[PDB]
Amino acid sequence: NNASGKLLALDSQLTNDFSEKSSYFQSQVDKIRKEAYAGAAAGVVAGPFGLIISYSIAAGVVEGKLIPELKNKLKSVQNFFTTLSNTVKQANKDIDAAKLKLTTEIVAIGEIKTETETTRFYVDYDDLMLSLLKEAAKKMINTCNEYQKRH
Amino acid sequence: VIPWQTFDETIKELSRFKQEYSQAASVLVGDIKTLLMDSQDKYFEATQTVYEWC
């Protein structure tokens, strides 16, 4: 029960921090573009040659190498998020199946313990030829053989 | 001429609010989950004991 709550507390933090990284990405790309196209405006210290040879470097390097690499890194983060969400979703199914497997066996053992206690109380009449104790023992034999057939 | 530092401070403040309250709510919901599973285990034990007596 403790791990089944820690797993949910991890899953909700994951699904919030993925969106707060996906907004940080768009807030940072615009900063890269601001710095590039603001530093490239200092090519007015030369003539018209020194302006185009700065805007060509800026709009080539930033728009051809730095933005698609960040988009590929964001795609890798998305694939990681999907994989870890599937891992959490599988761990929940494993825990629930184990708990159901244990409770079914508790009920199946109780179905034997009821008849065992009933026969134990039927012994206390001090009459071994009592037909009710004979029928209870014949019921316990069938119950024990049907338990042993299952395991 | 372009106020970028105030823009960054505003973005970081509005992100820190959400980070703080996600971190605060996740632990409490994960504790309520554990309590709701322990209650179901106690309920099963009590009803099975009464059924086995009956």
Numbering used by the authors:
A (entry chain B): 142 to 292
B (entry chain A): 34 to 87
Task: Reproduce passages from the article.
E. coli cytolysin A (ClyA), also known as hemolysin (HlyE) or silent hemolysin A (SheA), belongs to the α-PFT class. ClyA is a 34 kDa soluble monomer, containing mainly α-helices with only one β-tongue that transforms into α-helical elements in the pore complexes. Each protomer in the ClyA pore complexes is composed of five α-helices, namely αA1, αB, αC, αF, and αG. Here we report the cryo-EM structures of ClyA pore complexes in the presence of n-Dodecyl-β-D-Maltoside (DDM) as dodecamer, tridecamer, and tetradecamer at the resolution of 2.8 Å, 3.2 Å and 4.3 Å, respectively.
Soluble ClyA monomer was previously found to assemble into a 13-meric pore complex in the presence of DDM, but a dodecamer was observed in the crystal structure. Two top view images (or bottom view, as they cannot be differentiated) clearly indicated the presence of both dodecamer and tridecamer. Based on the particle numbers of total particles and those used in final 3D reconstructions, the majority of the complexes were 12-meric, representing approximately 80% of all particles, while only 11% were 13-meric. These observations confirm the existence of 13-metric ClyA pore complexes, albeit at a low concentration in this preparation. Final 3D reconstruction resulted in EM density maps of the dodecamer, the tridecamer and the tetradecamer at the resolution of 2.8 Å, 3.2 Å and 4.3 Å, respectively. The near-atomic resolution maps of the dodecamer and the tridecamer allowed reasonable model building with accurate side chain assignments. The inner diameters near the extracellular edge of the pore are 70, 72 and 77 Å for the dodecamer, the tridecamer, and the tetradecamer, respectively. Comparison between Prot_12 and a protomer from the tridecamer (Prot_13) or the tetradecamer (Prot_14) shows that the overall fold of the protomer does not change when forming various oligomers, indicating a rigid body protomer assembly mechanism for the ClyA pore complexes. The interaction paradigm remains highly conserved in the tridecamer, suggesting a single protomer-protomer interaction mode in the ClyA pore complexes. The protomer-protomer interaction paradigm in the dodecamer applies also to the tridecamer, and probably the tetradecamer.
